Copies of this chain bind each other. A is one copy, B any other.
Amino acid sequence: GSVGNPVEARRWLRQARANFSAARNDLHKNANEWVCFKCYLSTKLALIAADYAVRGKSDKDVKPTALAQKIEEYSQQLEGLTNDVHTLEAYGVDSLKTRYPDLLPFPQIPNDRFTSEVAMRVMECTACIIIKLENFMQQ
């Protein structure tokens, strides 16, 4: 898209970074669904930040993997972004499955769903996503 909004981009990135920092508060506390939801939301907000940075607008209705696909076309600097973002799904992480039992295979609840190993792999993916996007927004 044509004209970017750097003020709004910075605002959303600030929150994305806060969400990733806060994921540390739930580590090794039997709250792995909260590590994963925080990382999912960090990822979503960082992508929306980048969308503001380029186009001055976004959509919170669009799934992160689809937002990442559009954003990745903005520059070769973002190569690999969509693969990173899609890895969250591969670990069974999305907005609804980290929160609601009716979306999980009976009888699982979110508190039962994610191992500490998975929460760690999800943090690694998220850190890489934020780094690719911060690099791109720095220019």
For chain A, give the interface size range.
20 to 34
Residues in chain B near residue A77, CB distance under 8 A: none
B interface footprint on A94-111 (CB within 8 Å = 1, 0 otherwise): 000001111000110111
- Across chains A and B, which 9 residue pairs bring their CB atoms closest together, nearest first? A18-B111, A22-B31, A15-B109, A25-B25, A25-B26, A22-B34, A11-B101, A25-B29, A14-B109
Question: What secondary structure prevails in chain A residues at the interface with B?
Answer: helix
User: How many copies altogether?
Assistant: 2
- Chain A contact residues, CB within 8 Å of chain B: 7, 11-12, 14-15, 18, 21-22, 25-26, 29-31, 33-34, 38, 41, 45, 60, 99-102, 106-107, 109-111
